[PDB]
Design an enzyme around this catalytic site. Structure first.
Site, PDB file in Angstrom:
ATOM      1  N   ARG A   1      56.076  67.899  -0.377  1.00  0.00           N
ATOM      2  CA  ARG A   1      56.752  68.498   0.846  1.00  0.00           C
ATOM      3  C   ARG A   1      57.882  67.631   1.510  1.00  0.00           C
ATOM      4  O   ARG A   1      58.477  68.072   2.013  1.00  0.00           O
ATOM      5  CB  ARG A   1      55.763  68.952   1.803  1.00  0.00           C
ATOM      6  CG  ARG A   1      54.816  70.079   1.247  1.00  0.00           C
ATOM      7  CD  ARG A   1      53.466  70.332   2.096  1.00  0.00           C
ATOM      8  NE  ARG A   1      52.357  69.263   1.676  1.00  0.00           N
ATOM      9  CZ  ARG A   1      51.278  69.560   2.181  1.00  0.00           C
ATOM     10  NH1 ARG A   1      50.994  70.598   2.718  1.00  0.00           N
ATOM     11  NH2 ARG A   1      50.191  68.780   1.520  1.00  0.00           N
ATOM     12  N   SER A   2      57.333  66.281   1.385  1.00  0.00           N
ATOM     13  CA  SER A   2      58.238  65.378   2.192  1.00  0.00           C
ATOM     14  C   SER A   2      59.545  65.244   1.591  1.00  0.00           C
ATOM     15  O   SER A   2      60.685  65.248   2.274  1.00  0.00           O
ATOM     16  CB  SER A   2      57.633  63.863   2.329  1.00  0.00           C
ATOM     17  OG  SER A   2      56.569  63.885   3.160  1.00  0.00           O
TER      18      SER A   2
ATOM     19  N   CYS B   1      53.643  63.784   4.085  1.00  0.00           N
ATOM     20  CA  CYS B   1      52.653  65.069   3.913  1.00  0.00           C
ATOM     21  C   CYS B   1      51.588  64.423   3.553  1.00  0.00           C
ATOM     22  O   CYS B   1      51.025  63.527   4.181  1.00  0.00           O
ATOM     23  CB  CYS B   1      53.241  65.933   2.833  1.00  0.00           C
ATOM     24  SG  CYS B   1      54.180  64.947   1.476  1.00  0.00           S
TER      25      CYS B   1
ATOM     26  N   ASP C   1      49.922  72.653   0.210  1.00  0.00           N
ATOM     27  CA  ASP C   1      50.203  71.361  -0.515  1.00  0.00           C
ATOM     28  C   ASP C   1      50.663  72.115  -1.901  1.00  0.00           C
ATOM     29  O   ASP C   1      50.083  73.182  -2.304  1.00  0.00           O
ATOM     30  CB  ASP C   1      48.759  70.748  -0.794  1.00  0.00           C
ATOM     31  CG  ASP C   1      49.180  69.204  -1.408  1.00  0.00           C
ATOM     32  OD1 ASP C   1      50.216  69.041  -1.603  1.00  0.00           O
ATOM     33  OD2 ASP C   1      48.119  68.655  -1.333  1.00  0.00           O
TER      34      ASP C   1
ATOM     35  N   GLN D   1      57.606  67.957  -5.847  1.00  0.00           N
ATOM     36  CA  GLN D   1      56.356  67.666  -6.772  1.00  0.00           C
ATOM     37  C   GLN D   1      56.323  69.116  -7.701  1.00  0.00           C
ATOM     38  O   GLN D   1      55.414  69.217  -8.805  1.00  0.00           O
ATOM     39  CB  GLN D   1      55.032  67.437  -6.187  1.00  0.00           C
ATOM     40  CG  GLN D   1      54.917  66.072  -5.816  1.00  0.00           C
ATOM     41  CD  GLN D   1      54.483  65.212  -7.045  1.00  0.00           C
ATOM     42  OE1 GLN D   1      53.385  65.352  -7.543  1.00  0.00           O
ATOM     43  NE2 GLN D   1      55.514  64.468  -7.282  1.00  0.00           N
TER      44      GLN D   1
HETATM   45  O1  LIG Z   1      51.317  66.577   0.366  1.00  0.00           O
HETATM   46  C1  LIG Z   1      52.376  66.638  -0.587  1.00  0.00           C
HETATM   47  O2  LIG Z   1      53.227  67.759  -0.490  1.00  0.00           O
HETATM   48  C2  LIG Z   1      52.103  65.807  -1.935  1.00  0.00           C
HETATM   49  O3  LIG Z   1      53.168  65.601  -2.674  1.00  0.00           O
HETATM   50  N1  LIG Z   1      50.881  65.904  -2.365  1.00  0.00           N
HETATM   51  C3  LIG Z   1      50.578  65.110  -3.542  1.00  0.00           C
HETATM   52  S1  LIG Z   1      51.456  64.465  -4.640  1.00  0.00           S
HETATM   53  C4  LIG Z   1      50.435  63.819  -5.450  1.00  0.00           C
HETATM   54  C5  LIG Z   1      49.014  64.199  -5.115  1.00  0.00           C
HETATM   55  C6  LIG Z   1      49.177  64.953  -3.850  1.00  0.00           C
HETATM   56  C7  LIG Z   1      48.214  65.736  -3.135  1.00  0.00           C
HETATM   57  O4  LIG Z   1      48.418  66.175  -2.001  1.00  0.00           O
HETATM   58  O5  LIG Z   1      46.886  65.746  -3.476  1.00  0.00           O
HETATM   59  C8  LIG Z   1      47.778  63.861  -5.992  1.00  0.00           C
HETATM   60  C9  LIG Z   1      47.882  62.896  -7.093  1.00  0.00           C
HETATM   61  N2  LIG Z   1      49.393  63.047  -7.870  1.00  0.00           N
HETATM   62  C10 LIG Z   1      50.416  62.974  -7.025  1.00  0.00           C
HETATM   63 CL   LIG Z   2      57.561  63.752 -10.231  1.00  0.00          CL
END
Ligand SMILES: O=C(O)C(=O)Nc1sc2c(c1C(=O)O)CCNC2
Ligand SMILES: [Cl-]
Ligand SMILES: [Cl-]
Ligand SMILES: [Cl-]
Ligand SMILES: [Cl-]
Length: 284
Positions: free
Chosen positions: A223-224, A217, A183, A264
């Site tokens: 990741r998506s 994800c 993540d 992200q």
């Molecule tokens: O699973 C991913 O690749 C992903 O974008 N995860 C994300 S995006 C995202 C979060 C998370 C998480 O897993 O905590 C937490 C809150 N803010 C946005």
């Molecule tokens: Cl963003």
């Protein structure tokens, strides 16, 4: 490109401006309403309060009580590929998730996370781990059975049977589970990411004969987004005469018209470049 893209890559690397470029993208990204996602009645259908589908691209469930699922249709017109990006289902939305897979006629599900990551629940156990213990989703009248799995060193491919308990019609669903992508991080190599992507492509799961592949994800954006951006950019580089004109930043902004927050971290953006450059070379 690959020449023009690689040159651009080395320049960004040299100037050390990945963070700057990534921040530019966040600033320029589309901001569409998510009124439905934010209705009181839908609070429990969202994993993260800061991650919602836009109204215009959200996937609607064909159910008379509540049509809402946190999922977005990403339609890349020039690339001629669609994806459904969705959050990791919650314990109360697994039935919805499979209702969506059924109604949208998807052939494949791409999972890029694990159920628990660093001790936190990131995704429900939405498929059965044992053949003899099938799952029944009483709310959407679906049954799901593990048929077999093909466990590789850094990913697993599962054959699932999804049955509409109403009609007893069955469909085979392929589950492509990337198990070593952390993540907010990146794959261990471009090669292993590309091998995985190519396996998904070879399965027929991305074919227009089927509904859109479902990619998720934990939130369905980090990741998506990385997975889908690479795939689409590779399609463009192969279909465009003068593939050098493929601007990864512009493609990502086009994708973000359909769902917020795709990719992200700056290093995920950097990795997307590497994957596309290395993949272009392999395909060319
Ligand atoms: O699973 C991913 O690749 C992903 O974008 N995860 C994300 S995006 C995202 C979060 C998370 C998480 O897993 O905590 C937490 C809150 N803010 C946005
Ligand atoms: Cl963003
Ligand atoms: Cl897992
Ligand atoms: Cl969960
Ligand atoms: Cl472009």
């Amino acid at each position: 490109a690959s020449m023009e893209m690689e040159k651009e890559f080395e320049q960004i690397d040299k100037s050390g401006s990945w963070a700057a470029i990534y921040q530019d993208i966040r600033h320029e990204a589309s901001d569409f309403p998510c009124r439905v996602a934010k209705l009181p009645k839908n609070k429990n259908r969202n994993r993260y309060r800061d991650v919602s589908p836009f109204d215009h691209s959200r996937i609607k469930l064909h159910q008379e009580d509540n049509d809402y699922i946190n999922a977005s249709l990403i339609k890349m017109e020039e690339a001629q590929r669609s994806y459904i990006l969705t959050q990791g289902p919650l314990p109360n939305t697994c039935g919805h998730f499979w209702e969506m897979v059924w109604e949208q006629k998807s052939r494949g599900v791409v999972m890029l996370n694990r159920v628990m990551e660093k001790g936190s629940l990131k995704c429900a156990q939405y498929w059965p781990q044992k053949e003899e213990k099938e799952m029944i989703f009483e709310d959407t009248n679906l049954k799901l059975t593990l048929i077999s799995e093909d466990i590789k060193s850094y990913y697993t491919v599962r054959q699932l049977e999804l049955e509409n308990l109403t009609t007893q019609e069955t469909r085979e669903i392929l589950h492509f589970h990337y198990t070593t992508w952390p993540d907010f991080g990146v794959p261990e190599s471009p090669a292993s990411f590309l091998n995985f992507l190519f396996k998904v492509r070879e399965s027929g799961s991305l074919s227009p004969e089927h509904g859109p592949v479902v990619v998720h994800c934990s939130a369905g954006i980090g990741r998506s987004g990385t997975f889908c951006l690479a795939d689409t950019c590779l399609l463009l580089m192969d279909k465009r005469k003068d593939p050098s004109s493929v601007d990864i930043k512009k493609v990502l902004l086009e994708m973000r018209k359909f769902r917020m927050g795709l990719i992200q971290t700056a290093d995920q953006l950097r990795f997307s470049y590497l994957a596309v450059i290395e993949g272009a070379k392999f395909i060319m």
